[PDB]
Paper text:
To explore the promiscuity of viral PSI complexes, we constructed a phage-mimetic PsaJ-PsaF fusion in the easily cultivable cyanobacterium Synechocystis sp. PCC 6803. To get a more detailed view of the PsaJF subunit in PSIPsaJF, we crystallized PSIPsaJF and obtained diffraction data to 3.8 Å resolution. The model reveals three monomers in the asymmetric unit. A complete trimeric complex is formed from monomers positioned in three unit cells. The structure clearly shows the presence of the fused subunit integrated in the PSIPsaJF complex. Deleting the N-terminus of PsaF resulted in a flattened plateau on the luminal side of the complex. Three chlorophyll molecules and four carotenoids are coordinated by PsaJ and PsaF in the Thermosynechococcus PSI structure. We find that all of these ligands are probably lost during the assembly of PSIPsaJF and could not be traced in our model. In spite of the relatively low resolution, we find that the overall organization of the other cofactors in PSI is hardly affected in PSIPsaJF demonstrating the mild effect of the JF mutation on the overall organization and integrity of the complex. P700 in PSIPsaJF is reduced much faster by a respiratory cytochrome c than in the wild-type complex.
Author numbering:
A (entry chain F): 1 to 125
B (entry chain B): 513 to 585
C (entry chain A): 13 to 751
D (entry chain B): 659 to 730
E (entry chain E): 2 to 69
F (entry chain B): 367 to 439
G (entry chain D): 3 to 140
H (entry chain C): 2 to 81
The structure:
Amino acid sequence: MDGLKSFLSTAPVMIMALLTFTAGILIEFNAFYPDLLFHPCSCAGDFLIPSIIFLYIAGWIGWVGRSYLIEIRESKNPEMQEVVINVPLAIKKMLGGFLWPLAAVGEYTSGKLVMKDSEIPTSPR
Amino acid sequence: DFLVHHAIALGLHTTALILIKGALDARGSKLMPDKKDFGYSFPCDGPGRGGTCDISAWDAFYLAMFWMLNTLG
Amino acid sequence: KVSVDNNPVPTSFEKWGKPGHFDRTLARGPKTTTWIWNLHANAHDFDSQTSDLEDVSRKIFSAHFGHLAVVFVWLSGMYFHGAKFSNYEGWLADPTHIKPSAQVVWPIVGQGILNGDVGGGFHGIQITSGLFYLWRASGFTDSYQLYCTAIGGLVMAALMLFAGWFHYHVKAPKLEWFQNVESMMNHHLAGLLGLGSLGWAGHQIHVSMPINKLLDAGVAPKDIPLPHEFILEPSKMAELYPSFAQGLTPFFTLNWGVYSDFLTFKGGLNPVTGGLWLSDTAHHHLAIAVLFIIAGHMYRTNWGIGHSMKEILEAHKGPFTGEGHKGLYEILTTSWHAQLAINLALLGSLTIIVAQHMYAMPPYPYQAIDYATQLSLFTHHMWIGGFLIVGAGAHGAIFMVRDYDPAKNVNNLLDRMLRHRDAIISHLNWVCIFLGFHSFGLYIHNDTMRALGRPQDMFSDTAIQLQPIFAQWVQHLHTLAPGATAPNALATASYAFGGETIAVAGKVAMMPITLGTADFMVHHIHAFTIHVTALILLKGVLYARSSRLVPDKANLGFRFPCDGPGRGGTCQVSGWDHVFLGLFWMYNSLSIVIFHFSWKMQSDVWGTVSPDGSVTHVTLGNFAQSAITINGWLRDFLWAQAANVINSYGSALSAYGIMFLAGHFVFAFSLMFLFSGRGYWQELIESIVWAHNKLNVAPAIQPRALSIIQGRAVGVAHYLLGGIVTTWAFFLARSLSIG
Amino acid sequence: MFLISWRGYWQELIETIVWAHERTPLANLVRWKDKPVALSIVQARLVGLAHFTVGYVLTYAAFLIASTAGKF
Amino acid sequence: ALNRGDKVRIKRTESYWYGDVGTVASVEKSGILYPVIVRFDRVNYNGFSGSASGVNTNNFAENELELV
Amino acid sequence: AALYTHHQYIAGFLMVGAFAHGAIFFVRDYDPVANKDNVLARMLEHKEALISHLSWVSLFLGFHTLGLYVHND
Amino acid sequence: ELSGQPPKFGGSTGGLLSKANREEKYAITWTSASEQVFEMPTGGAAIMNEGENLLYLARKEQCLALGTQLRTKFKPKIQDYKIYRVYPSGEVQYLHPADGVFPEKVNEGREAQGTKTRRIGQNPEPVTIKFSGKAPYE
Amino acid sequence: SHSVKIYDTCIGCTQCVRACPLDVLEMVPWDGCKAAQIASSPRTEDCVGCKRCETACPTDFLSIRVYLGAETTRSMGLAY
Ligand code: CLA
Ligand code: CLA
Ligand code: CLA
Ligand code: CLA
Ligand SMILES: CCCCCCCCCCCCCCCC(=O)OC[C@H](COP(=O)(O)OC[C@@H](O)CO)OC(=O)CCCCCCCCCCCCCCC
Ligand SMILES: CC1=C(/C=C/C(C)=C/C=C/C(C)=C/C=C\C=C(C)\C=C\C=C(C)\C=C\C2=C(C)CCCC2(C)C)C(C)(C)CCC1
Ligand code: SF4
């Protein structure tokens, strides 16, 4: 799969995966106004539509993407893992996308989320 | 009216970003740690180190001006 | 004279997974984001990859085969779209009322609105490629004919693609082989152009001409017999054009004039067609063909007859030019950039000749009627010709940096003019200033005199006027050419010079284009804009190697940003930076040309003809009186004709409406790059990077602001995009709405 | 112009003009007491910004007044 | 002093790697101003415009380093 | 209309200049000794915290504000 | 005093100007084993005479651009070149191979100047040298 | 004219001397680094300020710096 490897460094294969959502998603995505109007905000609660689900989507992607950069750092193959996406990294992080914000909850609690200010570089004042 | 206000907020923040950055890194950055020795306004620092064009604090005001005009527009 | 190395390179997919292998700098790996951009901008730079001129010539040879392949795929795509996603058959039935349309848009997200009504019960996007007009003149009468043509293209596409592989991985030509210039020419001059022109003349006579004659009669396509049926029944080919009774042998007995039944010299436009007589274009290509076969027998080859271009060149010396063309043979048979520089200059200038000739002498049926297609094919070939003659300056300079050798160029034409480059530019500089004042300065004289209420002082047909005495005198000769200076030509070559105002349907196909002072001025604006563009590019070639500011510029290379803030500042001295500035002026120059074309044809040519013969132009002839001030262009051309696109919201043209804005966006976006520098941008990234170091999400490929060159390359890339997207939408929305 | 095109181009264009005058008869009779040179890098940014600013307000003002005074 | 292989934190100030972590490669020349050669995981800005990378190593003084 | 458009353009110029000379202060007058550990110096200490966030808000405003307008268009 | 043979050259416009006869011009001498073609910094091509050559150029940078060429674009790398600054007063002034050896190579006798007993990052604050004609690097 | 300075961080790689196109620099003996030599700037009267020298030095930050100064006929690279 040397040629497949070279096809793999080609990101936009993901854009093809996105259009494939239509097979399953287009079926239910009919009209879709569920309770956008009724909110007990003590009057006029019609701003309650699904803004919140946007957060889970970006989180499952971001943390997995961070887990791709962090897990690759341990390998000590910086140039290769960046130019050609390692299957184990992209698979593990992206496949655990639903449980990704969950493991991110554990990472935040364990203090794995934020690195040291001392360790981080600072520019001359 | 809702949208043009946020558009203006964009206009004030980005203009402040430029002006404030250019002020803070006026003494120097890790691309030019000794910027203070060269003064406020200087051309650049040659093509060396990747390139240093429009790097000075004077050049920050310069880039900032285009955004003020736009914000006022 | 065939020489070949067998299997010089294995065919393995290992290299595909090792990006940047072709360069020793990139081969080891990426450490910064700059590596990525560099991988792309060095991909086709085969010179910088290997110094073996034999190896690169093999890369180039098989690069062309790859290109011919995609062009075949593209070209086949147009035929396939014309066969299955078109109303061509519907258009062939009623050419004068149906609008040509290909490409159906899918009903989704409300974009179905772009499928506008184009008549004939067909909904889709109206095309301006003039393909429908090409098909008829080519003798197409069925969708299946286009369909078979589309498949043939994919065959060719695959065949071209195989040849590229074969001639680099199986049998690669030797360096000696590519250098057979005298022989290479004899084949292109006769094999490609000669037989190509002869072979097509055979099609025009046996397919196009007889069929198209029936469309004049309006036999309708289905009643018309198939093309090959004209050959199965020579009686059919005889019933039209009686000169087939004595078919062959007048050619061989030299009678010829018998064939005047179908090899004519009418020189005009078929009044039902609005296009050039197919009888002329056939006699034409037959004449061109012969001329080209002939011209392909001049050069030396293996049979001792012919010429040595080396002999001819070297035997051209004069008092003023020392040793003359000596050495020119060598550099044109050792440097590809030397060849490319010339080939672009001419190919580019030619594509412009195509534009200026295709509008005055419409070679296709019902083309002249479609003012959108006329405007679209003209300004199109204008730009292409425009971009090419800029690259002509790029590689003209690269040759000087890379492949110019002083020893092989001593007191010859090349060396001699490098020794007065300061004299050349100093004068081209002055001419540009002279043209600068005496063209634009005139418009400012008018705009000011107008506003001061002094219309008697300004430059105008009505007031004082600069009359193009010569161009007018030239027209007078062209119109009076038949029956005198062209006795065997019935009518003049183009009615733009003068004569009857040809009309089809209720529209003007072509009519005399009078020249006034309004036209005199814009002509000297064109001469002005062209000269400045030459100055920027020419100066870029001669001072590519050295100057009084940087004598060692050649060592710095062709593509470098600068030589530091020293010497007062040395930004953009390189030849690449002369292509950079040369692009903006190629743009600014041609924008005025296509703006001249649009308004002039709208105002003083196009329009509707009433049965009596009186013409009503779309701009009512406001050109000669408003095209002499900038405010007039701002008002009576831009502000007025832009009303079509900005109000396109809610119609089939709504695309052009939002596309008109899209162009505006990337235009302004370009200014972000052209006004700033990476010095600021790198410092900004440092603050941004820190936020990732804070959350442990810093990328391995360290972020780096674009190179100073790329910063400029991206700048011009967007500025020219938006600048042309804007015009592209403005022209289409305008021309489609007017007719 | 001052914002897109940068110095080195103009410096190399000026010296050819310098050449012309020194070589032109009758004109060389006049010699500059100040050597001609292209604007500095900072200068060009400044002048480029100056023009960009003037044109920004003069264009908009002329539109504000005329549009409002013309219509009321 | 500092041994080869020891991971070190930099406290110079103007260094592109100031605050970042480096690795001591060698100690040279006995008596000299900047003996400690350090190699870094990621390159600096150094290089003419268009360079695909930078410098990996630089000499520091012993007094402006911290062991990790 | 003129008086309003006028005074805002005046104001816009003043705000830029205010930061311009604010940058010049750091280049030619700032003393890290006299201003050691005070509110002024500590700004420089976390300048990359300021800028990185001022960048985010601008990114946040620009993508959405432009986003809604292009959506409607 | 010292001289050579002017290279065989048809002439160019990129050459000298008023500065040469007003302010200063520079002179460059070199010895070549054969007559061979070389590139003029003033554009075009010329050929050096066998033996001693002499050439006047308008700028010091031009001579050094030729000097580096002479030492890099020939099979017999000519490193025998000497550059002078000649004033209109007749006064000449030796300039390149200054002391005798090229500056690339360390040579005893050269007095150090421009050096700093200090890191570049250890320069004083601008406020320190306020309203004094001096800059931090002084 | 412009000002050229050398700092104690130089490592005597001599790359700057052979980069300068106007012969402004030269190497001299020094006991501060292993190469036992340091860059010098005796002929600043002829430096234009191209900053080719700074481009060549490999120290984390430059050991040689060019502080642009009062312009002259020479420091502007004027051939007239
Ligand atoms: C399919 C079998 C095959 C294989 C395994 C190879 C393998 C190789 N080729 Mg060959 N080549 C092939 C077919 C093949 N090639 C064909 C069909 C052509 C004619 C177009 C060429 C012309 C060619 C040249 C001139 C060169 C090579 C080189 C190489 C070597 C390095 C280039 C590289 O891999 O980076 C991968 C690069 C790409 C995959 C480029 C893709 C970018 C575009 C968009 C392709 C252009 C369009 C294309 C022609 C048409 C596609 C669409 C169409 C089907 C509708 C490598 C051993 C180079 C070499 O020898 O190394 C120094 C060399 O210079 N090839
Ligand atoms: C006859 C065809 C032809 C050929 C074979 C070449 C070949 C070459 N050129 Mg030349 N060039 C040409 C025409 C041609 N050029 C013309 C007409 C111009 C005038 C604009 C130029 C201007 C030019 C310059 C300034 C340079 C070259 C260079 C080169 C070399 C490297 C190019 C490269 O790296 O690709 C890389 C290509 C890219 C990285 C893509 C850039 C992005 C593009 C082109 C924008 C396209 C806009 C897009 C179509 C519309 C937007 C759509 C979008 C929204 C999706 C290579 C030998 C370079 C060189 O010689 O190396 C030192 C170089 O400096 N060319
Ligand atoms: C429906 C269409 C839509 C689209 C196309 C976008 C697109 C975008 N959003 Mg928006 N967003 C939306 C709806 C949408 N959003 C709605 C309905 C809400 C209300 C909840 C938001 C609230 C929101 C916030 C607060 C932010 C964005 C941001 C962004 C940008 C970067 C995030 C990203 O996608 O990159 C890929 C994902 C990553 C790079 C990792 C995750 C990054 C995120 C967004 C932070 C994690 C979410 C967290 C729980 C909330 C942040 C803390 C909060 C208290 C401030 C991107 C342009 C970010 C931005 O503009 O920064 C400049 C930003 O911070 N969005
Ligand atoms: C209209 C043109 C334009 C645009 C879109 C921008 C946009 C931006 N500027 Mg720039 N600027 C401009 C002109 C422009 N500027 C000009 C003329 C100057 C004078 C030189 C400047 C000087 C300037 C400075 C000094 C700074 C900026 C900064 C910024 C960023 C601030 C973040 C933000 O506002 O929201 C978010 C981003 C956007 C609104 C732009 C996104 C554009 C699109 C449409 C997103 C979608 C991408 C699209 C799908 C890609 C497909 C393309 C494909 C076909 C190739 C933003 C990216 C600041 C910055 O860098 O932020 C930290 C910064 O400090 N600008
Ligand atoms: C309306 C404006 C006023 C009109 C007035 C009429 C002026 C007509 C212009 C005369 C051109 C002079 C040609 C030199 C005739 C000529 O070639 O001389 C001969 C000489 C070389 O001749 P040789 O004897 O060396 O030839 C033998 C060998 O060289 C073999 O090549 O060429 C030169 O010396 C270079 C001079 C170029 C001059 C640059 C002129 C730039 C173009 C100016 C004209 C533009 C008009 C537009 C179309 C091009
Ligand atoms: C459209 C198209 C296509 C198609 C094409 C075609 C198919 C065509 C063609 C063509 C052809 C089909 C051609 C042909 C032919 C020919 C020629 C060109 C000829 C010739 C000749 C000669 C010149 C000779 C003569 C003679 C003499 C004189 C002597 C004796 C006798 C003889 C006869 C030998 C394709 C799809 C691919 C692609 C796309 C486009
Ligand atoms: S670019 Fe920024 S740096 Fe390289 S030169 Fe023109 S200015 Fe001095």
